[PDB]
Amino acid sequence: RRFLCGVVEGFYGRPWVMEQRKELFRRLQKWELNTYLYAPKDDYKHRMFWREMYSVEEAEQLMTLISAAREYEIEFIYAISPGLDITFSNPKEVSTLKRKLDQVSQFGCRSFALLFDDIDHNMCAADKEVFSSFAHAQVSITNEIYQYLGEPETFLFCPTEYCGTFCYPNVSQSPYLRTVGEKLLPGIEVLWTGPKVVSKEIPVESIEEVSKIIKRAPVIWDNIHANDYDQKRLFLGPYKGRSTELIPRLKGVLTNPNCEFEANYVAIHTLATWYKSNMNGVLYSPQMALKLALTEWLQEFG
Amino acid sequence: RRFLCGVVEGFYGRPWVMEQRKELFRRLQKWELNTYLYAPKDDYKHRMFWREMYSVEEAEQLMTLISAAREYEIEFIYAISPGLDITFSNPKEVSTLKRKLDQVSQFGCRSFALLFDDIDHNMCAADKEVFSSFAHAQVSITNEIYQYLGEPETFLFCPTEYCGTFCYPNVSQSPYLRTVGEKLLPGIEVLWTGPKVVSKEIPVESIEEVSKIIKRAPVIWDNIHANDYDQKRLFLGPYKGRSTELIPRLKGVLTNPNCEFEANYVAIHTLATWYKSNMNGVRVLYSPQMALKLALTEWLQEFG
Amino acid sequence: MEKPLYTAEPVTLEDLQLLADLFYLPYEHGPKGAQMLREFQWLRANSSEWRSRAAKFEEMCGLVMGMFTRLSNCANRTILYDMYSYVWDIKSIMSMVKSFVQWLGCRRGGLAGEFQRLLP
Amino acid sequence: MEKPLYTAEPVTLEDLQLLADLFYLPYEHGPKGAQMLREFQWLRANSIEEWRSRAAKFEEMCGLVMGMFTRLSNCANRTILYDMYSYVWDIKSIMSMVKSFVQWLGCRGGLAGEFQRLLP
């Protein structure tokens, strides 16, 4: 069974450096985790300036980074966020998108993700004509790139309505998700942050609710340990509020942790413990997982 | 006359990396400042483990740093804090300090600092026999090291009573400072932080007061922009509360600024504006508000 | 007619002057900061001219937020990354302080901060 | 007799347990943290012999927070320390002030902090 469990670097702030990312891979390997989602918000070329191309300096780095992902048996996913200034209709746009992903495929990356997180809900007049609803514009360009890349095994999609609070009128009645669930190809996976952006709890019932509308089990983008929104608070708590009952009902869990890389041990270690506790569809105690992780972490301090 | 003006990297926390330190020297130069006191609390080999020598890798790092300092006409002053576990009377200890400071000269360093800040006043038995007071113990080893190295031009000393509120019973009546003033060698400079550790103002009156009991003009270790004590606070304000009149009455001012390197533009800029305002001054000339607008105008060019 | 390309407003001197007032000195607040604080203290001590000053305070808050944005979009990430925590933090406290004002004219910080509050 | 050498005590599992409990989760405090918060609120509400013992246990627990800081700062792994240093240093400070306060009961944060004090 294919469950994507790992870390997402998708925070606002100073991004992680080569050797940190390398260390993260060593860790994820040792803890039997398997994925890594490359979405650092600093990266202009992943978000703001998506149309732009990586330099030779940049190219060599990403190659070296992807080479370490393979080296440590970690799946590397390259995310791209174009929904800021993209003209969905115009084919030069769609052409440049393909050119970028081509360059990324040259680096040794096969798995991708198209993020439409935190972007303006209203379309420009050019796109407005061509597409029925904002969802139709996103789903069109997604399916296009997915098939263009030879329908890859790992292809994620981040909806604009990526959590429960953001749903208009609510999850079950959202015509946006209804559109995606009906029109997005089944080979593509959908990202979900749960009832909220930083969900305290992710109830099983809530995951059945959203699964029915997206017509698939989602991949959880988990913001539980995220601290970009309050860099005056650190989270050394155990992964908590997610039932092991969720595992057979999900395609994966990618944790968006604290900005401070070293402060993420307990988050990832406890995610691994949570995952391994019910790998196959009370098994997990946050309090116990914490002691487990701190006992292991203690060695690093010497 | 010679005046030490610059930055003292002497804070608790993540130290400045090489590219940053090289950049500081470039900025200090452009702004016509001349010193950099190396006292980062993370360098274990400078403080807690003063005895231990720099490894090959470390030794290389220091050389490049010391070289960069000379390359930008900045005086590099190496600081050493042995006051934690030192036995002043034991000569094996005094030999270790000589041995440690030597390795540092071979990197290119010609300037030195011996700090006795934030340490235990109560001596060991060995030292209680040989030395009549803690003040006598420090002056002994400082004077000794000053002559060993070949009476260098730039030799600084930080006393245990380094601010007004640390003296017992007071600045003027201190038996500690009395011993320092009287016994410490003439060529050795004394570090003072003003009325308090982080002084709001550093009045002339208090500088005259401390100068008498130390029988010389001090070199100010300024903690005005330091933020290690509350890193939920950053200081972008201009250098303020120190009269331009202090310049003819001091041997220097070395600012200990925010841990965060890039946030020290105004701090070092306004300090330079201040120094240069009464450089040639013998014994108003500086507006903090104006000094700020100057700094902010210059800094803005670094954002695009 | 199409979607316009991404452009960002540069950091201005008026922003740096505001930034330095918010993060001034150990014993003193900057004029702009000491002021905003007095105005919020004042609007809270009142419940019903008030709306005349409240509209100005909401613009002042807006300036701190505008300032954060331009600072975050700026070319020099290095300068911003060294102050992101402080800058991001004041923008967040202002946003909710602003919101609280709009609520008055229509009728976090962790564990250390909680112990901080429990003292005089 | 010569001055004793400096030999740093290492980080214990109990230190990390306290650390994790002081910096827990977005919507929850760590068992220890919440307990220290309940203990302070009770000790403040009074001025029996049950107080002299509860204030003793609390000041001892504030000791542990300083203890944990001291040990974390002397550890060999600088990297881990510096990624957290601010947060850990702050709570130790606030804890040192809170420790003195409960001793005396038996006899900061800048501008963002200030605005946060005037909000409900």
Side-chain angles (χ1 to χ4, degrees), chain A residues 1-109 111-204 206-302, chain B, chain C residues 1-50 52-106 108-120, chain D residues 1-47 49-51 53-120:
Chain A
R1 198 264 180 118
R2 258 185 117 266
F3 192 94
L4 308 120
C5 198
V7 160
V8 46
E9 183 180 332
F11 52 73
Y12 293 92
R14 186 190 293 113
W16 297 331
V17 313
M18 180 58 59
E19 215 48 52
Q20 279 183 316
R21 293 172 173 158
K22 274 234 265 157
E23 189 53 46
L24 171 72
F25 304 155
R26 279 143 206 168
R27 286 183 191 175
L28 298 162
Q29 181 174 232
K30 189 190 167 195
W31 302 337
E32 294 138 66
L33 293 163
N34 48 79
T35 342
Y36 171 60
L37 181 52
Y38 182 97
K41 302 282 154 193
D42 161 81
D43 200 332
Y44 279 136
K45 279 155 194 192
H46 137 71
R47 198 167 151 82
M48 292 145 109
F49 303 174
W50 63 271
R51 301 186 186 92
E52 298 203 21
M53 300 278 148
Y54 291 120
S55 69
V56 163
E57 314 84 80
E58 288 170 300
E60 212 238 276
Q61 284 297 261
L62 284 183
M63 275 181 233
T64 309
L65 168 62
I66 291 155
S67 307
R70 279 126 42 173
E71 181 188 325
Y72 296 117
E73 297 162 3
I74 311 304
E75 182 168 30
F76 180 122
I77 309 174
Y78 177 97
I80 190 104
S81 203
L84 315 106
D85 47 6
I86 204 159
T87 328
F88 282 99
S89 67
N90 186 294
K92 304 182 261 184
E93 292 284 60
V94 190
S95 204
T96 315
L97 190 45
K98 277 163 185 180
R99 301 294 66 79
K100 189 59 165 293
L101 281 122
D102 260 329
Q103 184 178 51
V104 178
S105 301
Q106 300 304 113
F107 307 144
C109 179
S111 311
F112 299 97
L114 236 75
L115 326 163
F116 297 99
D117 72 328
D118 308 298
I119 63 160
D120 162 44
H121 236 97
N122 273 310
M123 292 180 289
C124 66
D127 307 343
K128 259 190 179 192
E129 316 152 325
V130 185
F131 307 99
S132 345
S133 86
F134 182 44
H136 291 262
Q138 294 177 50
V139 170
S140 171
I141 197 144
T142 306
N143 287 331
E144 206 164 335
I145 301 292
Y146 172 62
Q147 291 175 316
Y148 161 86
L149 302 153
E151 304 192 324
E153 184 195 44
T154 299
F155 195 94
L156 319 158
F157 169 78
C158 190
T160 294
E161 282 164 42
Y162 62 83
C163 75
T165 50
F166 289 17
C167 290
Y168 200 149
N170 63 107
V171 178
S172 33
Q173 288 141 61
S174 176
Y176 173 87
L177 295 177
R178 199 142 58 246
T179 299
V180 183
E182 281 181 1
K183 303 294 168 208
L184 193 88
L185 278 140
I188 311 173
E189 318 298 347
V190 169
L191 294 145
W192 197 244
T193 63
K196 280 201 274 81
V197 159
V198 180
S199 297
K200 172 163 181 148
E201 248 142 276
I202 305 168
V204 179
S206 86
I207 285 310
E208 285 165 295
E209 190 173 348
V210 66
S211 287
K212 274 188 152 193
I213 201 123
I214 65 168
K215 292 183 163 191
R216 68 200 78 198
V219 166
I220 301 305
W221 171 303
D222 216 309
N223 288 295
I224 182 167
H225 292 81
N227 83 331
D228 43 23
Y229 60 89
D230 195 357
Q231 284 233 81
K232 243 194 201 182
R233 279 209 292 177
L234 202 54
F235 304 130
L236 304 179
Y239 188 72
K240 187 176 177 312
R242 298 82 173 104
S243 186
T244 57
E245 298 311 307
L246 287 182
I247 313 173
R249 301 178 170 83
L250 294 173
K251 168 70 187 189
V253 170
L254 309 170
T255 208
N256 192 34
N258 294 260
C259 299
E260 308 74 359
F261 169 77
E262 283 307 330
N264 286 315
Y265 198 100
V266 175
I268 303 159
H269 189 282
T270 73
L271 176 57
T273 292
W274 171 86
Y275 176 56
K276 293 181 279 186
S277 92
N278 197 17
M279 272 208 74
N280 334 274
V282 115
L283 293 162
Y284 173 93
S285 165
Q287 247 224 337
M288 288 188 76
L290 176 67
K291 198 174 185 181
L292 280 193
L294 303 168
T295 306
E296 202 176 310
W297 201 22
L298 185 64
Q299 290 318 107
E300 303 280 74
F301 295 83
Chain B
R1 70 194 230 81
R2 212 179 195 253
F3 189 95
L4 300 161
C5 215
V7 172
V8 39
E9 188 194 327
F11 46 82
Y12 288 100
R14 194 200 310 270
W16 295 336
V17 295
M18 182 84 77
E19 304 195 322
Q20 272 174 333
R21 277 155 189 183
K22 274 201 209 206
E23 174 54 20
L24 169 66
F25 303 159
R26 257 167 254 134
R27 290 176 183 175
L28 290 174
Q29 187 190 223
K30 179 204 176 186
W31 298 343
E32 297 140 58
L33 286 171
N34 47 63
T35 337
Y36 167 79
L37 173 57
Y38 178 92
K41 309 266 177 274
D42 164 86
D43 194 337
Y44 276 152
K45 275 151 193 208
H46 123 86
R47 203 167 153 75
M48 301 136 250
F49 305 150
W50 60 273
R51 290 188 203 81
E52 282 170 44
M53 301 256 152
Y54 294 106
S55 72
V56 158
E57 308 80 1
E58 289 165 18
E60 168 283 302
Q61 290 289 293
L62 274 149
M63 278 215 79
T64 337
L65 185 59
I66 302 181
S67 295
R70 205 184 290 100
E71 198 202 322
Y72 299 116
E73 314 167 279
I74 296 308
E75 188 138 75
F76 185 116
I77 310 184
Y78 175 89
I80 195 123
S81 264
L84 300 124
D85 52 8
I86 196 162
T87 323
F88 302 90
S89 46
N90 177 13
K92 195 242 93 197
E93 289 285 87
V94 194
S95 301
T96 301
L97 187 53
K98 280 163 180 188
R99 221 183 303 120
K100 188 65 206 261
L101 293 156
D102 267 301
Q103 177 188 225
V104 176
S105 293
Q106 293 166 38
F107 302 148
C109 203
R110 301 284 101 89
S111 315
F112 296 95
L114 239 89
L115 330 169
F116 297 105
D117 70 293
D118 326 315
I119 60 169
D120 174 34
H121 222 99
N122 289 278
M123 296 186 286
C124 75
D127 292 319
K128 288 203 172 191
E129 285 159 30
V130 187
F131 306 100
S132 79
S133 93
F134 192 31
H136 287 282
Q138 296 163 12
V139 169
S140 158
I141 199 147
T142 315
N143 281 349
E144 205 158 335
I145 296 293
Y146 177 57
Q147 295 190 286
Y148 173 89
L149 293 159
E151 285 207 0
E153 180 176 49
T154 11
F155 203 96
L156 282 77
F157 164 93
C158 186
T160 292
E161 301 178 3
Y162 60 75
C163 63
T165 69
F166 276 24
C167 307
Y168 196 77
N170 56 89
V171 175
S172 40
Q173 283 188 266
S174 178
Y176 174 84
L177 294 192
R178 231 211 284 108
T179 310
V180 178
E182 274 173 50
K183 303 273 166 70
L184 188 78
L185 255 140
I188 310 167
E189 299 312 323
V190 181
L191 291 140
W192 188 256
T193 80
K196 307 190 246 84
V197 186
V198 182
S199 308
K200 187 175 182 154
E201 270 88 75
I202 303 176
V204 194
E205 194 173 318
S206 68
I207 297 302
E208 284 164 341
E209 188 184 65
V210 67
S211 284
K212 279 157 185 167
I213 195 83
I214 65 156
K215 290 186 142 212
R216 67 201 86 203
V219 166
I220 301 281
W221 170 310
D222 219 322
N223 290 325
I224 181 193
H225 292 99
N227 76 335
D228 54 8
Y229 55 85
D230 198 358
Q231 270 185 269
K232 274 187 178 194
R233 291 167 90 217
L234 195 65
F235 304 112
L236 305 179
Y239 189 69
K240 184 191 253 213
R242 292 88 174 109
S243 195
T244 38
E245 265 308 291
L246 295 173
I247 311 167
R249 291 182 156 88
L250 294 166
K251 178 72 205 297
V253 171
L254 296 180
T255 201
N256 187 42
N258 312 266
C259 304
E260 303 77 19
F261 178 86
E262 288 302 339
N264 294 329
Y265 203 98
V266 171
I268 307 156
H269 196 272
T270 64
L271 174 78
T273 280
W274 182 89
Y275 175 49
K276 304 183 282 191
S277 81
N278 187 55
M279 212 168 148
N280 302 279
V282 284
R283 256 274 170 89
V284 294
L285 299 101
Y286 172 94
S287 167
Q289 185 47 60
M290 293 187 76
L292 183 55
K293 194 163 179 205
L294 269 177
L296 298 177
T297 298
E298 208 158 294
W299 197 22
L300 186 61
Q301 302 309 106
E302 304 310 297
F303 290 73
Chain C
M1 214 232 197
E2 286 213 321
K3 190 83 192 175
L5 287 162
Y6 185 70
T7 54
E9 297 174 289
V11 181
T12 81
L13 183 109
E14 304 60 54
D15 293 327
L16 301 190
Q17 293 167 313
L18 177 62
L19 180 67
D21 276 25
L22 303 150
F23 303 106
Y24 206 59
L25 287 164
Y27 302 103
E28 182 186 356
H29 285 303
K32 294 153 171 222
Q35 184 177 269
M36 278 199 75
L37 194 47
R38 281 190 279 102
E39 303 320 315
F40 181 88
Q41 281 173 105
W42 190 83
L43 296 164
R44 187 203 50 179
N46 313 329
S47 37
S48 65
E49 195 241 1
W50 182 105
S52 310
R53 271 156 80 162
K56 292 179 156 184
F57 179 75
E58 277 171 64
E59 281 163 345
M60 263 288 148
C61 287
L63 285 155
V64 175
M65 268 149 279
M67 175 218 86
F68 167 73
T69 337
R70 287 181 289 277
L71 254 149
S72 15
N73 289 291
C74 94
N76 208 330
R77 327 296 300 127
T78 260
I79 289 166
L80 177 77
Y81 285 160
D82 241 294
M83 301 189 299
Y84 202 111
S85 124
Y86 305 96
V87 185
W88 166 268
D89 212 75
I90 195 94
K91 156 253 135 65
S92 296
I93 318 297
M94 279 320 172
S95 201
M96 44 204 75
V97 135
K98 185 184 184 166
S99 299
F100 185 63
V101 144
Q102 299 166 340
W103 174 97
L104 282 151
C106 170
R108 221 211 148 84
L111 187 64
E114 284 165 63
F115 271 108
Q116 212 163 326
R117 224 184 188 271
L118 274 153
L119 290 187
Chain D
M1 188 209 78
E2 290 202 18
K3 171 98 194 200
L5 247 157
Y6 177 74
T7 48
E9 32 178 20
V11 169
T12 76
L13 173 58
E14 286 64 47
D15 288 330
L16 300 178
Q17 274 178 321
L18 196 40
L19 183 68
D21 274 51
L22 299 195
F23 294 99
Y24 209 70
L25 289 166
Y27 306 133
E28 206 180 316
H29 280 295
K32 309 239 185 94
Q35 178 263 317
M36 272 185 110
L37 211 66
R38 280 191 293 102
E39 276 292 306
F40 189 50
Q41 287 158 322
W42 183 92
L43 289 163
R44 190 221 204 168
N46 324 332
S47 61
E49 205 177 281
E50 98 157 326
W51 200 99
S53 60
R54 277 162 91 152
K57 282 283 164 178
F58 183 94
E59 279 157 36
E60 172 204 305
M61 267 207 79
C62 296
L64 301 165
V65 180
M66 264 106 99
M68 165 203 63
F69 179 75
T70 302
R71 291 184 284 282
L72 273 157
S73 43
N74 303 343
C75 78
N77 199 336
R78 321 271 54 217
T79 305
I80 303 182
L81 175 64
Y82 294 137
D83 260 85
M84 302 189 296
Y85 198 77
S86 62
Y87 297 108
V88 208
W89 158 249
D90 251 293
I91 200 113
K92 173 258 147 194
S93 283
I94 296 296
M95 229 38 78
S96 206
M97 285 173 221
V98 167
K99 191 203 183 239
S100 286
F101 199 94
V102 194
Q103 278 175 320
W104 164 100
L105 276 171
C107 91
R108 186 106 198 161
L111 198 60
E114 251 140 319
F115 278 72
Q116 195 151 38
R117 203 159 295 108
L118 324 169
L119 279 172

